[PDB]
Design a binder for these strands. Structure first.
Ligand SMILES: Nc1ncnc2c1ncn2[C@@H]1O[C@H](COP(=O)(O)OP(=O)(O)O)[C@@H](O)[C@H]1O
Ligand SMILES: [K+]
Ligand SMILES: [K+]
Ligand SMILES: [K+]
Ligand SMILES: [K+]
Ligand SMILES: [Mg+2]
Ligand SMILES: [Zn+2]
Length: 531
DNA sequence: GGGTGGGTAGGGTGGGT
């Protein structure tokens, strides 16, 4: 990762053009960090990789250079939806652009092929899927003619991490993309990604073969962002009522994003907010382009205060003044949470990120991510973050990314750093043994306990057939009992057992690997609690 | 309502189980 700072200047011959395009065409005041350095390197003919979090402004770094020189820029994109979002932005800006995909008509393909070799064509950006490279010789023939005509002099590979086999959403189509630099060496190539471990970037560079390449990585910490974790109420109605209290009481009239586990959750939450007077609109990539345009148009004009998006893939939410981000359910992984929470405060002003932690959400996410190899492990790391009540959120967040060392001070910008309080180490060894007795009886009774059922037996609720006479009621609030069970599951005193039913995957709790340590009478189990 | 109508699939606040 060579230093961008040498390139953070506007003394270049093209600098006047770059400033002219940025202000007059893109209607943008100032470059965001690493934008200018990335743009200069591409205009210098050098290969560059830009690692920037989603919503950081990656797209400008190759759209602007396209307008600074004659001819068009080839953009490789993996998703049709991603291509559509860029085209809508470009169309609003008056920049000529087009796309090719498998579903594109024969006539449109003919037009795009004609425009590529056309001397006077107005096209500046052409977006194609990697399939059009690997599996269309006809498109390659036009591309070769265009290259020899100097029609196109640069290439952008969005989601460049897909080239590497280790990258998320690795695509066999992306493997073939090395043909580009081999066949068109004179065209500079730029790779854009938001999730980029260093070994992933080097592998992708090998695939493209590109040999020497600048890699610019955005700073991890966002000083203006406030990170908080709140308990999620057991019912679904006081929760939305609580959210409306937060929105009116602290962010009255301010834009914000609500993240939900599922698409139907976003629709359900959107209706609930609307009935309470909050102007809200659901957004997800499953939306038709007309729906996406209307929600984006309404949100930008502040006709809609709150956008309710889905965690799974929701990511056309570009607005510089997002004052708050609220997670209706906890993120799937810490890696996802940083991306989702990082939408807020792109204007660099103070913004709040509130995560609502719920015991039920743990198992709902666990069943979904069962096929993922590390899905449970990534989720359990997220659970640990919610559990913690003393450590600074930035320190906790940093520890989940070995790729970044963040020494920046919190400056009272998280719930734990804020709040001066004292903590003990409450013993919970007795509680763990009591839960084991309930579980052991179930195994002999050949019945599986859901976490809901297991907690019911502990408190004296539920079917009496799943009871131990000697187990006394915890005499603690139910939410506290959920945390104790969650702590045991994290520590592997309990383990999740998954049942595959026809309807859905179901999580059941079972005796964990570490329960045999309870045989030692001197063994103790403790957890942080406020005094 | 019925399970040869289907559950990589429509979803469980649609209802029976
Ligand atoms: N220099 C800048 N100043 C202000 N806003 C910017 C700048 N660069 C990009 N943006 C805005 O950030 C938003 C998100 O950028 P996007 O192209 O989605 O980046 P990414 O590819 O990282 O998601 C866009 O709406 C864009 O208008
Ligand atoms: K843009
Ligand atoms: K049914
Ligand atoms: K039906
Ligand atoms: K049915
Ligand atoms: Mg992007
Ligand atoms: Zn802190």
């Amino acid at each position: 990762d060579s230093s961008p700072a040498a390139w953070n200047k506007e003394d270049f011959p093209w600098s006047g053009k770059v400033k002219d395009i940025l202000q007059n065409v893109f209607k943008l005041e100032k470059f965001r960090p690493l934008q200018l350095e990335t743009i200069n390197v591409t205009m210098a003919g050098k290969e560059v990789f830009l690692v920037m979090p989603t919503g950081g402004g990656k797209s400008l770094c190759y759209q602007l250079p396209a307008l600074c020189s004659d001819g068009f820029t080839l953009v490789i994109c993996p998703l049709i939806s991603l291509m559509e979002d860029q085209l809508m932005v470009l169309k609003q800006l008056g920049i000529s652009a087009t796309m090719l995909n498998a579903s594109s008509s024969k006539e449109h393909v003919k037009w795009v092929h004609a425009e590529m070799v056309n001397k006077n064509s107005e096209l500046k950006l052409i977006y194609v899927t990697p399939e059009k490279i690997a599996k269309s010789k006809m498109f390659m023939s036009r591309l070769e003619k265009a290259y020899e005509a100097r029609r196109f002099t640069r290439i952008a590979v969005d989601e460049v991490h897909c080239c590497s086999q280790w990258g998320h959403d690795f695509r066999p189509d992306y493997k073939a993309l090395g043909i580009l630099k081999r066949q068109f060496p004179n065209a500079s190539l730029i790779g854009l990604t938001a999730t980029a471990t260093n070994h992933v970037l080097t592998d992708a560079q090998k695939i493209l073969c590109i040999e020497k390449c600048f890699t610019f990585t955005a700073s991890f910490n966002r000083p203006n962002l406030y990170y908080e974790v709140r308990q999620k109420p057991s019912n679904t109605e006081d929760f939305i009522e609580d959210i409306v209290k937060l929105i009116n009481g602290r962010y009255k009239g301010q834009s914000g994003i609500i993240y939900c586990f599922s698409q139907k959750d976003s629709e359900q939450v959107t209706v609930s907010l609307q009935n309470l007077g909050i102007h809200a609109g659901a957004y997800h990539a499953n939306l038709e382009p007309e729906d996406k345009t209307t929600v984006h148009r309404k949100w930008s004009a502040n006709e809609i205060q709150v956008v309710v998006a889905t965690v799974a893939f929701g990511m056309g939410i570009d607005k510089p003044d997002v004052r708050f981000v609220i997670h209706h359910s906890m993120s799937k992984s810490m890696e996802n949470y940083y991306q989702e929470s990082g939408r807020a405060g792109r204007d660099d002003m103070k913004a709040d990120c509130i995560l609502y932690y719920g015991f039920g959400d743990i198992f709902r996410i666990s069943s979904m991510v069962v096929m993922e190899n590390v899905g449970q492990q990534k989720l359990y790391e997220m659970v640990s973050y919610c559990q913690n009540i003393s450590k600074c959120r930035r320190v906790l967040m940093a520890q989940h990314f070995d790729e970044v060392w963040n020494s920046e001070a919190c400056n009272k910008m998280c719930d734990n750093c804020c709040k001066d309080s004292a903590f003990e180490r409450k013993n919970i060894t007795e509680y763990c043994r009591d839960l084991i007795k309930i579980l052991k009886q179930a195994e002999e009774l050949n019945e599986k306990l859901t976490p809901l059922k297991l907690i019911d037996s502990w408190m004296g609720k539920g079917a009496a057939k799943l009871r131990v006479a000697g187990v006394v009621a915890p005499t603690l609030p139910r939410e506290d009992l959920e945390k104790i069970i969650a702590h045991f599951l994290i520590q592997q005193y309990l383990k999740e057992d998954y049942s595959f039913t026809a309807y859905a995957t179901i999580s059941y709790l079972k005796i964990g690997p570490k329960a045999n340590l309870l045989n030692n009478e001197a063994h103790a189990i403790t957890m942080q609690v406020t005094k």
